[model samples]
Every structure is written in structure tokens, then in C-alpha cells.
Target: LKWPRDLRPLAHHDLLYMGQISEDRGDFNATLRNFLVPRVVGSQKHREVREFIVRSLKDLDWDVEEDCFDGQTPHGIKPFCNVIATLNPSACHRLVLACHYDSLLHKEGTFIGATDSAVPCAQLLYLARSLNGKLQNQKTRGDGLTLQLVFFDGEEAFERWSSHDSLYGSRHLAQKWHEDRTSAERLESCLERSEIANQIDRMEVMVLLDLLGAENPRFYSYFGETQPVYRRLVNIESRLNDAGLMELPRRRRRTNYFSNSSTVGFIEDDHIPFLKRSVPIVHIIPSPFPDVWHTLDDNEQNLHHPTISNLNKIFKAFVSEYLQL
Candidate 1:
């Protein structure tokens, strides 16, 4: 099989299932509440958030690994842990959706980082839970590519953001995956040794979500390699908006969340390490970040419920279409 395959543009009829799902918003609200607490590494809340994610994925029967490690931060060496959950561990290729789960270190112990990433982290968990059944059926049918979710730790620097202090988990994991090809032993029958030899090489594309959950946040295509997939996201939003299917709160203006243009530069985040390793990446973070980012105000109160709900629906449709489920 090829390393990167073309994702079919989803037909209108294929979106029927998403509309058929109930209009309940309880799951969305509860999941966000669970992560609204300050989750800086070494805090009690951080540990609970990690545990919750691990347990949630495990309950869905995903092969979950807590990639635990230590790193030298500006403050000192701090313990860090990343969560990797795969729908089918033995699949030949993977479609990765990643976000950092750790909150920035606030001296007062009060930063919640909801839009900064709690929302994205919650979204990943929600995606896994919401699509568990279809993902399982795809696995049982022996699909070549499977879904994988990565929750990176140590994405926030203890002090200033820098090359040495940031991206600790992603840097470590990318290196580990590049060298750890022993897992490839299981896929010998389906892949050629020369074409694919490592875990990092098996990634079809990595779509990273960050700085979301705010109302009217806009996204631009940042990488050409993944532009086609990015365009599909733009299309998905348009179709959903046109059908009046995207639920928006009263007095809120209907707007497009994705821009139909390409950007020249990249924004730093957990995806950097993987991008350097030649992985096709789609950075879904907004251009002008939400006003509440990195502040105590970035809590659940600043989040728009209907906007978050619409994002959840858009992602569910995106993932379902990407997998051709």
C-alpha cells in the first residue's frame, strides 16, 4: 500500500448519519467540565485529567499507552506523560489527531487553559467516544488505516517558550517512533520493508487541533502537503452551515470558521517534532488566537456552548468522511 492515499470527498448522503444523531449537548458540556480544572504538570488535577483520558479510551477497547517520561524544564526536571490511543494497533497506516493536554504553569495555580487546549483535548476524547462504534466496525473489516489520538504533555514551557524547553513530549515521542520499528514486524505481510519501516513513517497525516472553543475563530491552511484535507474541512463547514444543521446560540452571527486561503508560515505547537520528521500535517489552530488564551479568563465561562457543539459535529463528520466510514 502507498504511504499517503487520496481521501474521497464525502457525498451529501454520507452526512445523513451526523444529522440523525440526537441533539443532546450533555456529553459536550460534561467532557469540557472534566478538563476545565488547572492541569499543569505535577498538580493533582493534572494527574486526574490523565487518568480520565486513559480510562475513557480503555473503556472503548482502544490500545492505550501512557508514554511516561521525564524532561529537564527551566524550573527543573519535571515528570511528563503523553497518552497514545489507537483504534487498531496493528493497522498499516494511521490518521493521527493530536492536542496537548497540559495547562501552562501559572504561579497562582489558577490557569484553566480552556481554549488554549482543554477544549481540544476534550474534543479528542469526545471524538473517540462518539465514533467508537464505527471505528470498531472499520477495524473488524480490516481497514488499512486506523485512527490514533495523541495527548501530548510538556507542550507548555515552565518559563519562556524556547527550543530546549518546549515540545518535550512530542520531541521525545517522534524520536522514539522513528527508531522503534519493531512494531512494524506485525505488518510485514502487507507492507514492503523498504517502503515503510517505522511507526512515524506509517502516519498518513496528522491533524492537530488547538486554540478552539471560542466563537468566530478562523483557521487558514498552513501546509501544502495537507491542503487537500484542509480544504475538505472548509467544505464541511460550508455544507453544515448551509443546511442550518450547525447549531448556533441566539444573537450569534453565522460565520465561517475556516478561511479559503493558504498561510505562509507555521505556528509553533506539539506538531513541530512530527513535521520535522516528514509527516504530512494539518495545523487547525486559529490565526489570531482567542483573546482569553493563556489567561485565567480562558476558563469554561469564556467558551461558547453552541460553537463548541458545532465543532464537535464538524469533526465527527470530518473523521467519518476521512475514514470513509
Candidate 2:
């Protein structure tokens, strides 16, 4: 079921198998290695992570494109780019899974930024990888639903986070897409603009992931309209718990999305630029902030298998269900 449950369930056998496979930590943990270094915009590690993401997509044989541009910030100028990998070329409706790949710029030492975004970025790969053949088959069968995994660059503020300083890539890309519905290079190989709009209307929903890879995290959905999609994620989690994969008592909930206890408010991040244009946005970042948020302690050591694996299963299940994979 995609949302309203009218559609017949996708070939969920693949997704169910992937749910178990995602528990293997080596793939995701190894993917986190590329981001174990500081990846401030325009730096060597930052560029390398782009290569890793693009190459990983290519290895899976998906259509990948890089939206590169010059980003203006209070600190100075930097190369801002967003890597977009699509699971289908002709599918008009899309669901976007996005995360920022850059670590915050620091004056002195290293910032692994594992949970701040590295793990989320890698988990995007995990989610995409799990859908490997299923998403493609949907395209072959003429299903309008497709998946797009986007890695945004320069989400961190160069000096201090502010309206103008943060979300450099998203703001730039949203503006660019609002102007050009089709690019020779864009349409030649990648996405087909569903309608002639310079904005993000081409997407059905844009789900932004951040501050992930923490133990027992909770997500709050600020936008009330998207609660149906949010509840779908919660529903999938409950199913996973009932299946015993989550290793928790059926009566006790470990992870939640849009809980009544959740604080309802907008969180500023890469999703805002698109949301303002009326894009259905779901912010999946942890509420109350992660313990290692923008701090030195947010390194790889802070990540645990329980948190990472749980997020992986949830994302894989949600996206698989959404795409009818």
C-alpha cells in the first residue's frame, strides 16, 4: 500500500528480505568511513564523499546527476552541489530522500559529524541499495512512482547558522529548478520534469533525514498535513516490532514518528526551501536535538548498531512501501 492502501501491495518480498539484510552492519559502517573525516564544502574529503555517493549509485546502475554551483555565504564563497540519483527515468511522480553530506566547518580540529549527517547520508545509500531491483521493475511496468536519493552539500553554516547562511545547496537548487524545467543534460539522462515548473512540484513528497544514528530517537512532524505519510512510517515500525526484528516487547515502543509527546514546530534544514513552494515535506530529524549535535562527541564512536539498524529498516520499509517496490 502506497498511502491510502487502495493500491495492491508491491512485491514486498524484496523489501522484507532487505529488512533482514540491512542488519548487516559492515555495509553501512563501511559507507560511514568516507565521512569519518571532516567534509567541509570544497575540501578534499567533501569532494571525495561526492565521488563515493555518485560511484555507489553508478555501481547500482542508477541515473545520477550533480547539481553544482557557487554558494554565497556570510563567511565567504564555496562550491555548493546536490547529488541526485534517480531510480527511474520516465516515472513522473517521485519521492525524494535527502540528507546533507557536509560537516560543519571548524577553526581547529576534526569533526567526524557522523550523526550530524554522515550516518544519515550513508543510510540514504543503505535505503537505496535495498531497493536495488524492485524500483527498476516498477519503472519497467510503467508505474508512475519512483525514488530519488539526493545528497546535499554545504548544509552547515560557514560561520554561524542563520537564515542566509544555512541551507546553501537547497536554496540554490530550489531557485534553479524553479527557473528551468528541463536541462539538455538533465532530461537527456536523468529526471523528466513532470510539469513545466522551475520549482519542486515534480516531487510527490520530499523526506529530509538528519541528526540520525542515535539510540532510541523520536521524530516529530511539524506539518500536520503530512501526518498520513508520517503515520505510514509509524505503522511500518509497529509491524516491524510485531515481526520481532526490532527485538523489543510488542507492548513497548522503541522508535516513534509523530508521537503526541512530539513537539510540533518547524525545524530549519534543507527541506525548507522546497516546503515554502508547497512541496509536501517530512522532516525526519530527531527532536530535542541529538546529544552529540554539532559537538566533538558526535564522532563514529557515538553511533550504535541498534539506532543505525532501526533507522535503516524503517527507511527501507517506508520507501519500499511508498514506491510500491
Candidate 3:
């Protein structure tokens, strides 16, 4: 996170205020309610958000590539940019980790998105740093897999109610990948002959994290949209459970809003694009989002470090085991 220099002291001051009011239930609720509103979406602050993510990864020694794409709104005006980073280019197998960095533009005045995505972005950078050079030496470091970190832009819709208004970056990337794979030469050149064939058979699995830095976070797998990805998620979840880091609720028959839901249930987030491509996707997200989801109450004061630490550990363990790193 950027820790906005000029606003740092103010943020701490606000934290003190929150700490004082937290003792009163009604006052705390009011404080949280004011925190969820978006405060940085369309302003220069949004640019800072992107820069913070870029700088964090660069600081960790990863070669960063910014994929700045023009996205059209319903009226066809283009505005948006996507950032992506790749680690351990030598590894043939790929695993994609993604999260959207944009907040709802209309709510920019109040929303800081500390947990909505900032925490996950931080964790992703750390993960990239952790796995950096290990993949090139599998014998000493064990088998390592290529990791792709994507920070999607324009995930929140221009129009609040529709999916049609959002996911531009992911859709564009997916289309590009599809187009690239159409040519055997392009596929072979980009991923090597064997890896290309494997990807064609089955695309790389993706894991998405969002709003997980809450004190009592729980995730309910989106039932309908999770079938193709459940096995891998369950495996990762089982490992986390074994380590006593977190718990994945038992899958009970639940109605799924989307088709092809997983054994776990329905989770609504940026993982939808990869899921549509039949790529196994594991979504590690917090449900209900502390009742501050799109409200003005989401900020640094509400962030829980233990939750972030646990999530970091779980991700590290899963990646280590999955990539055999």
C-alpha cells in the first residue's frame, strides 16, 4: 500500500478516532459505514494505487510489464489500464494470480479499498518476491511454476447493476490469448510446443483474492460457477485447514446464481473470466465483506494484520505445494 505521504498522519489520526469510538457499538457502526465509500477511484489517487502496486513488485526485483489497454464504456469512450507481471520465465507451467485494483468511481470520495483489494495486491507482490528465482533451479529449490500476477482495471461497472459494464481488462486479455493460440507458430513460440499443447488441452488455473483482511472472514464458494475449479481449490483449502490457518466451510447443496458452480458454492468477483474459459480458478475471498462492502467504511483502520498474515501463509503453502517449489 502507498501510505499516501501527506495523508499518513491524517490516517493515523482517524485510526485514533476509530479506536476511541469502537467501544460504542452504534458509534463503531457509523464509523464503519462511512469507511466503505470509494475515495480514490477516478482521481489522481487511483493513479497512486496503480503506482504503489507497480513499485512494490519492482522493489522485489520482478521484471514488471504494464499492459495499459483502452477500455470503452457503454457510450464507447475509452478509459482504463491493466497491469501484469510475470515471475520465473524459465518455468514451463503457468499459474495466474489476479485481483482488480479499481474501486467504484462514483464512490471515490469515501472508499479506500484497503481490504477490498489493497491487501491482496500486497500479498501478491510478496508472493512474487518469494518465488522469484527458485523456479530456475528446481533441483535445489524443488520444482517451480511460472507465476503471472494481473491487476485488472475497470472491474467495477460504469453502471452499477450490470456485468456488461465491467470486466473489460480480463475480457480483452482473454480474447488476445485466444487469438494468439489460434496460430500453431504463435502458440509454440509463446509457450513452447509441449506447453502450448498442454495449455490448449487445459488452460492454467487461476487464484483470486479479494476482501480477505477482515477479522472474521468467511468464504462461500459460488456454487454454480465453481465445478471446473473445485478440486484444486479444495486441495489448497485442505492444506490451509491442515495447517490450521483457516477453514473452508463444508460444501452443502446451495443454489448457485451462475451455471457450473463448484462444490463449495457461489463467490462473485473477478475470477469469472478465467472460469468462463474453463480454467480452474480458486477464489480466496471474504464473503459479506464486513457489511461495509461498497460502503464508505473500508479503510486501513479496519484492516486486520493477522488476517493478512494468515492469508499470506496459506497462499505461500498452496503455491509451494502446487508448483512443488
Candidate 4:
């Protein structure tokens, strides 16, 4: 996608503002409240997560679409909803930021899945609230590329994870786009097509966020080419740290994250479909899985307020910087 740009690192004033916007803990908490429930796929709570996603994006005047499908599972085929939100529905190309919202179906206790995706989902909301103005400003001034937020359902395996059972929503969407993209693009065939797949060609990368709500989880890019985008987050974190605006609520030291430590291994997450289909990918899930992953303790108590703010700021900064805001 041909988005606007200044082709330079952030200016000093932009840096200072980044400190203020990304470091806001109150916003983080407010966004996290929406996903503080057991969002199991095909369950009422999961529908609430979908509803919340649609409502929040729509409230911001974003163009939203719901892609609901029956994903085959061990119990049977269950319905899953993939919600896509974008600033410009008419734009041909976009950069996507994606995360999963469904928690593991637990039999005994509440599995809020805070780190699994609640906080990552919150990060999407935080970025939206923080950058909607700049995004709009860029849109008004030029042909600003679209910045899309996709909340995918049914990312977890119904019984156990495997190549087929997991990533039901993503697999369907990727195949749907690959097969129908050209058809959608043929304006003469169908007028006014606003389906999310219509904008697949413009997808720069689907930056997938998973297992990132916890504290001190490091990040690395699966592909070497994606390291540049990864570095942007790292630089933003350091800049925030040096400016003295990124203070931690717990420890005196800040954990610098998103730097590339390896380039070969790939983890199973929502981006697999898009990645395999040749859509550029940046898997932002933290390396060395956080201990709370897939456990009952993955709740608000384990979530660090500082890590929340740090990621929020880094991503918000990355979006604005990428858009040349």
C-alpha cells in the first residue's frame, strides 16, 4: 500500500507526544475490561467479545465487517466470527494488526485469557483511541493507506491443537480472500463490495499478537525482512525509556522488547494462514512463552500495568511512524 510518509525517524515533538499517549495506563485498564471474561468460541461470552469489538470500532467511525463462519471442531462445527475494522473502507491497500480473542474452554474455572489475547486485544483498542485522530488527519490530507484491526475468533483448538483444527477462522479467511480477491476486484462484476477480503492485496503484513499481555516476554520476527518493523518498536521503547516517560509500576528497570533474537523458528498462531498465503507477516507474540500461558493464572492479577503501557506505546508509535503521522 502506498501510504504517505516523511521518510525519517520521528521528530523530537512527536517523540515527546508518543511518550504521553502510549504510556497512559488508564486507557490500558479501560480497554482491558472489555475482554475480562471467558471468551470461548460459540459461547455467549465470546459473542460479547465480538459485540464489544464491533461497538468499539464503530464508535470510532471505522468501517467494520463481520465474517461469521461454521468452523469444524471436535464437538461439531461451531460458529466463529471474524471482525475486521478499518479507517477507509474504500482504500485498496492496508496494513493489518491482528489478534485472537477466544480463550481456552475450561471445565472448572474462569479462563479470562488476559495475556493470551485480552491485553493484546486491549492494545488494539488503545491504538485506535490514541491514533484515530492522526489517522483521520492523514486521510483528510492524502491517500492514507488503511490501518486495519482484525479480531479473529476460534483461534484455539476445540479439543487439542493440530494443523487443521486450530486457526479455523484464519484458514477460511485466507482461502476466501485468495480465491475471491480477483472477483471482488472486478468492479464490473459487483459494485460496492466492502468485504474485508477485497482489501487483501493491500495487506502489508498481518502483525499477529498473542501471549503478550504478561510481563517480560521478549519478541522476535520470524522473517529477517520483518526485522525493520520489529526494530521500530524497539527504538520507540528505548526512546520512551530515555525520555523518562516510560516508568514501570513494578520494577525499577524496563524490559526492552521486540528485538530480533532468531529468524528460523515459527510458532503456531493466527497469522499462519496469511503467512502461508504470502501475506507479509510479523509475529509479535513474545518468545519464551510467558508462564501464565494457557493457565488459570492468566488473569488481571498477573498482568503488569507497565508491560501493558509499554506495548501500547510501542505499537501506537509504530502505526503513526509507519503512516508518517
TM-score per prediction, in order, is 0.93, 0.88, 0.68, 0.89
Candidate 1 residue pairs in clash (backbone atoms < 3 Å): none
Best by TM-score: 1
- Candidate 3, residues 92-132, lDDT tens digits: the string is 44577888777765435655676776667666765665545
**Model 4 quality (TM-score):** 0.89
lDDT of 1 by residue, 52-108 (tens): 999999999999999999888888888999999999878888889999999998776
lDDT of 4 by residue, 1-325 (tens): 3212233688768878876753356666877898999898888888988888899899999989999988678889799888989887665556799998888887667888888888889888878887778888776643535688888888888777899778888887787777765434542222243333444555756788888767677877677656666667778878888877675766466657866466566688888788777677888887788998788998888988767776777777778777778
In model 4, what are the clashing residue pairs, if there are any? 93-202
- List candidate 2 segments past 4 Å from native: 1-18, 182-199, 248-254, 257-262
Model 2, 240-321: lDDT tens per residue?
7656567443556655543643464668899898887877888888787888888888888888767678778878888777
Of 1 and 3, the candidate ahead on TM-score is 1
- Which parts of model 3 are misplaced by more than 4 Å? 1-42, 59-61, 74-78, 106-108, 131-144, 182-203, 220-265
User: Once all C-alphas are superposed, what RMSD does model 3 give against the true structure?
Assistant: 12.1
Q: lDDT scores for all predictions?
A: 0.84, 0.75, 0.56, 0.76
Residue 307 lDDT (model 2): 64
